Amino acid sequence: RTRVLILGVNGFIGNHLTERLLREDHYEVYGLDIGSDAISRFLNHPHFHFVEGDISIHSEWIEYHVKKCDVVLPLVAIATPIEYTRNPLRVFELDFEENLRIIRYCVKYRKRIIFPSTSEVYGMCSDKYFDEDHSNLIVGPVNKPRWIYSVSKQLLDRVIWAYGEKEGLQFTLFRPFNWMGPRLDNLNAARIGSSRAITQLILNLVEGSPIKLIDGGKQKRCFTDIRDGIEALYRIIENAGNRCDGEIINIGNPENEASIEELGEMLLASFEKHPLRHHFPPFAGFRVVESQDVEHEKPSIRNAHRCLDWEPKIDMQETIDETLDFFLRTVDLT
């Protein structure tokens, strides 16, 4: 069986991916993290092995697990907008420098790396559909520090591409577009995965604070149910016919497009009709705020079509209802 090393397994993607791989009987999962509360259900599974670790502290212990395994999925990164500007240097050191160390262990021991790039690399790209192979990448002047995350991730993609081109690194990059479903990552957990925007909104409803609409909340986004997203990630790991080698693949549902405002209204509506609504405060309402932005973020999914024979199935309403439902029933009221 194939050994899958998941760095930063204690969260949204690690939970769903692990459940997926373990349902099949030809995988061995090694989940590395500093905690295990998010995947405790798997600690006793015969084919899951928790590994104590931190990519900023451990060097050797991680290198060892890269040599021991077959496929590597590094999910540790700080991807919360306020941080790009609040603690830029840490975002850079963790997201760029520490992950570069892991990319290098992979080329050194000739292992396969499945790397989470980001939908933010496209920046202010004018294409209606962001294309992994044709769209230009657009960011603002260096005096707009918000772009440091975007560019750091883009540079890593290029370094990976160079290793694959000059040193035989076998890799696949994937770019998730607002994945959502049960077991969302904490708003400030340094793990790549769940949509921060929908997480923030649900928190607004749960805590009784207002839903802020930056300049009207007109910017559009696409949302993907984790059942669809993880199926695609799963197929990248399978890599049938080796079709994913050297590929960059957007993973999103371009049909589930909505403005921040409409998404807010959809969650509210689903929220108002929920059986546990009374355990939460009254809706505080929509606050129009006004403070560099991205006005649209829709993916082209031709590569996912080609390399994975994948098409997203769950409609917007289903994703919304299920994500909110699991969240509300999981909250500790006391």
Coordinates of all heavy atoms in Angstrom, one line a residue, residues 125-162, unseen atoms left out:
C125 N -6.5 39.2 -11.9 CA -6.6 38.7 -13.3 C -7.9 39.0 -13.9 O -9.0 38.8 -13.3 CB -6.4 37.1 -13.3 SG -6.8 36.3 -14.8
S126 N -7.9 39.6 -15.1 CA -9.2 39.9 -15.7 C -10.0 38.8 -16.4 O -11.1 39.1 -16.8 CB -9.0 41.1 -16.7 OG -8.1 40.7 -17.8
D127 N -9.4 37.6 -16.5 CA -10.2 36.5 -17.2 C -11.4 36.2 -16.3 O -11.4 36.2 -15.1 CB -9.4 35.3 -17.3 CG -8.1 35.5 -18.2 OD1 -8.2 36.4 -19.1 OD2 -7.1 34.8 -18.0
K128 N -12.5 35.9 -17.0 CA -13.8 35.5 -16.2 C -13.5 34.2 -15.5 O -14.1 33.9 -14.4 CB -15.0 35.4 -17.2
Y129 N -12.8 33.3 -16.2 CA -12.4 32.0 -15.6 C -10.9 31.9 -15.5 O -10.2 32.0 -16.5 CB -13.0 30.9 -16.5 CG -14.5 30.8 -16.5 CD1 -15.3 31.6 -17.3 CD2 -15.1 29.9 -15.7 CE1 -16.7 31.5 -17.3 CE2 -16.5 29.8 -15.6 CZ -17.3 30.6 -16.4 OH -18.6 30.6 -16.2
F130 N -10.4 31.7 -14.2 CA -9.0 31.6 -14.0 C -8.5 30.3 -14.5 O -8.9 29.2 -14.1 CB -8.7 31.8 -12.5 CG -9.1 33.2 -12.0 CD1 -9.3 33.4 -10.6 CD2 -9.1 34.3 -12.8 CE1 -9.5 34.6 -10.1 CE2 -9.4 35.5 -12.3 CZ -9.6 35.7 -11.0
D131 N -7.5 30.4 -15.4 CA -6.9 29.2 -16.1 C -5.5 28.9 -15.6 O -4.6 29.8 -15.8 CB -7.0 29.4 -17.6 CG -6.7 28.1 -18.4 OD1 -5.6 27.5 -18.2 OD2 -7.6 27.7 -19.1
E132 N -5.2 27.8 -15.0 CA -3.9 27.4 -14.5 C -2.8 27.4 -15.5 O -1.6 27.6 -15.1 CB -4.0 25.9 -14.0 CG -5.2 25.6 -13.1 CD -6.4 25.0 -14.0 OE1 -6.7 25.6 -15.0 OE2 -7.0 24.0 -13.5
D133 N -3.1 27.3 -16.8 CA -2.1 27.3 -17.9 C -2.1 28.5 -18.8 O -1.1 28.6 -19.5 CB -2.3 26.0 -18.7 CG -2.3 24.8 -17.9 OD1 -1.4 24.5 -17.1 OD2 -3.3 24.0 -18.1
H134 N -3.1 29.4 -18.7 CA -3.1 30.5 -19.6 C -3.3 31.9 -19.0 O -2.9 32.9 -19.5 CB -4.2 30.3 -20.7 CG -4.0 29.0 -21.5 ND1 -3.0 28.9 -22.4 CD2 -4.6 27.8 -21.4 CE1 -3.0 27.7 -22.9 NE2 -3.9 27.0 -22.3
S135 N -4.0 32.0 -17.8 CA -4.3 33.2 -17.2 C -3.0 34.0 -16.7 O -2.1 33.4 -16.1 CB -5.3 33.1 -16.1 OG -6.5 32.7 -16.5
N136 N -3.0 35.3 -16.9 CA -1.9 36.0 -16.4 C -2.2 36.3 -14.9 O -3.3 36.3 -14.4 CB -1.7 37.4 -17.1 CG -1.1 37.2 -18.4 OD1 -0.3 36.3 -18.7 ND2 -1.3 38.2 -19.3
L137 N -1.1 36.5 -14.1 CA -1.2 36.7 -12.7 C -1.0 38.2 -12.4 O 0.0 38.8 -12.9 CB -0.2 35.8 -11.9 CG -0.1 34.3 -12.4 CD1 0.9 33.6 -11.6 CD2 -1.5 33.6 -12.3
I138 N -1.9 38.8 -11.7 CA -1.9 40.3 -11.5 C -2.0 40.7 -10.0 O -2.9 40.3 -9.3 CB -3.0 41.0 -12.3 CG1 -3.0 40.6 -13.7 CG2 -2.8 42.5 -12.1 CD1 -4.1 41.3 -14.6
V139 N -1.0 41.4 -9.5 CA -1.0 41.9 -8.2 C -0.7 43.4 -8.2 O -0.3 44.0 -9.2 CB 0.1 41.1 -7.3 CG1 -0.2 39.7 -7.3 CG2 1.5 41.4 -7.8
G140 N -0.9 44.0 -7.0 CA -0.7 45.5 -6.9 C 0.8 45.8 -6.7 O 1.6 44.9 -6.6
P141 N 1.1 47.1 -6.5 CA 2.5 47.6 -6.2 C 3.0 47.0 -4.9 O 2.2 46.4 -4.1 CB 2.3 49.1 -6.0 CG 1.0 49.4 -6.9 CD 0.1 48.2 -6.6
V142 N 4.3 47.0 -4.6 CA 4.7 46.4 -3.4 C 4.2 47.2 -2.2 O 4.2 46.7 -1.1 CB 6.3 46.2 -3.3 CG1 6.9 46.1 -4.6 CG2 6.9 47.3 -2.4
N143 N 3.7 48.4 -2.4 CA 3.2 49.2 -1.2 C 1.8 48.7 -0.8 O 1.2 49.2 0.1 CB 3.1 50.7 -1.5 CG 2.2 51.1 -2.6 OD1 2.2 52.3 -3.1 ND2 1.3 50.2 -3.0
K144 N 1.3 47.6 -1.4 CA 0.0 47.0 -1.0 C 0.5 45.6 -0.5 O 0.4 44.6 -1.2 CB -0.9 46.8 -2.2 CG -1.1 48.0 -3.1 CD -2.0 49.0 -2.4 CE -2.1 50.3 -3.2 NZ -3.1 51.2 -2.6
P145 N 0.9 45.6 0.8 CA 1.4 44.4 1.5 C 0.5 43.2 1.5 O 0.9 42.1 1.9 CB 1.8 44.9 2.9 CG 0.8 46.0 3.0 CD 0.8 46.7 1.7
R146 N -0.8 43.4 1.2 CA -1.8 42.3 1.2 C -1.3 41.2 0.2 O -1.6 40.0 0.4 CB -3.1 42.9 0.9 CG -3.8 42.4 -0.4 CD -4.6 41.1 -0.1 NE -5.1 40.5 -1.3 CZ -5.8 39.3 -1.2 NH1 -6.0 38.7 0.0 NH2 -6.2 38.7 -2.3
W147 N -0.6 41.5 -0.8 CA -0.2 40.6 -1.8 C 1.0 39.6 -1.5 O 1.4 38.8 -2.3 CB 0.1 41.3 -3.2 CG -1.1 42.1 -3.7 CD1 -1.2 43.4 -3.8 CD2 -2.3 41.5 -4.2 NE1 -2.5 43.7 -4.3 CE2 -3.1 42.6 -4.5 CE3 -2.8 40.2 -4.3 CZ2 -4.4 42.4 -5.1 CZ3 -4.1 40.0 -4.8 CH2 -4.9 41.1 -5.2
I148 N 1.6 39.8 -0.4 CA 2.8 39.0 0.0 C 2.4 37.5 0.1 O 3.3 36.7 -0.3 CB 3.4 39.5 1.3 CG1 4.8 38.9 1.4 CG2 2.5 39.1 2.5 CD1 5.7 39.6 2.4
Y149 N 1.2 37.2 0.5 CA 0.8 35.8 0.5 C 0.8 35.2 -0.9 O 1.3 34.2 -1.2 CB -0.5 35.6 1.2 CG -1.1 34.3 1.1 CD1 -0.5 33.2 1.7 CD2 -2.3 34.0 0.4 CE1 -1.1 31.9 1.6 CE2 -2.9 32.8 0.3 CZ -2.3 31.7 0.9 OH -2.8 30.4 0.8
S150 N 0.0 35.9 -1.7 CA -0.2 35.6 -3.1 C 1.1 35.3 -3.9 O 1.3 34.2 -4.4 CB -0.9 36.7 -3.8 OG -1.3 36.4 -5.1
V151 N 2.0 36.3 -3.8 CA 3.3 36.2 -4.5 C 4.2 35.1 -3.8 O 4.9 34.4 -4.6 CB 4.0 37.6 -4.5 CG1 5.3 37.5 -5.3 CG2 3.0 38.6 -5.1
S152 N 4.2 35.0 -2.5 CA 5.0 33.9 -1.9 C 4.5 32.6 -2.4 O 5.3 31.7 -2.8 CB 4.8 33.9 -0.4 OG 5.5 35.0 0.2
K153 N 3.2 32.4 -2.5 CA 2.7 31.1 -3.0 C 3.0 30.9 -4.5 O 3.4 29.8 -4.9 CB 1.2 31.0 -2.8 CG 0.8 31.1 -1.3 CD 1.1 29.8 -0.5 CE 0.5 28.6 -1.2 NZ 0.6 27.3 -0.4
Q154 N 3.0 32.0 -5.2 CA 3.3 31.9 -6.6 C 4.8 31.5 -6.8 O 5.1 30.7 -7.7 CB 3.1 33.2 -7.3 CG 3.3 33.1 -8.8 CD 3.5 34.5 -9.5 OE1 2.8 35.5 -9.0 NE2 4.3 34.6 -10.5
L155 N 5.7 32.1 -6.0 CA 7.1 31.8 -6.2 C 7.4 30.4 -5.9 O 8.2 29.7 -6.6 CB 7.9 32.7 -5.3 CG 9.3 33.2 -5.8 CD1 10.2 33.6 -4.6 CD2 9.9 32.3 -6.7
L156 N 6.7 29.8 -4.8 CA 6.9 28.4 -4.5 C 6.4 27.5 -5.6 O 7.1 26.5 -5.9 CB 6.1 28.1 -3.2 CG 6.7 28.0 -1.9 CD1 5.8 27.3 -0.9 CD2 8.0 27.3 -1.9
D157 N 5.3 27.9 -6.3 CA 4.8 27.1 -7.4 C 5.9 27.1 -8.5 O 6.1 26.0 -9.1 CB 3.6 27.7 -8.0 CG 2.4 27.6 -7.1 OD1 2.4 26.8 -6.2 OD2 1.3 28.3 -7.3
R158 N 6.6 28.2 -8.7 CA 7.7 28.3 -9.8 C 8.9 27.5 -9.4 O 9.6 27.0 -10.2 CB 8.0 29.7 -10.0 CG 6.9 30.5 -10.6 CD 7.4 31.9 -11.1 NE 6.2 32.7 -11.5 CZ 5.7 32.6 -12.7 NH1 6.1 31.8 -13.6 NH2 4.6 33.4 -13.1
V159 N 9.2 27.5 -8.1 CA 10.4 26.7 -7.6 C 10.1 25.3 -7.8 O 10.9 24.5 -8.2 CB 10.6 27.1 -6.1 CG1 11.6 26.1 -5.5 CG2 11.2 28.5 -6.0
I160 N 8.9 24.9 -7.5 CA 8.4 23.5 -7.6 C 8.5 23.1 -9.1 O 9.1 22.1 -9.5 CB 7.0 23.3 -7.1 CG1 7.0 23.4 -5.6 CG2 6.4 21.9 -7.6 CD1 5.6 23.3 -5.0
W161 N 8.0 24.0 -10.0 CA 8.0 23.8 -11.4 C 9.5 23.6 -11.9 O 9.8 22.7 -12.7 CB 7.4 25.0 -12.1 CG 7.3 24.8 -13.6 CD1 8.3 25.2 -14.5 CD2 6.3 24.3 -14.4 NE1 7.9 24.9 -15.8 CE2 6.6 24.3 -15.7 CE3 5.0 23.7 -14.1 CZ2 5.8 23.8 -16.8 CZ3 4.2 23.2 -15.1 CH2 4.6 23.3 -16.4
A162 N 10.4 24.5 -11.4 CA 11.8 24.4 -11.8 C 12.4 23.0 -11.3 O 13.2 22.4 -12.0 CB 12.6 25.5 -11.1

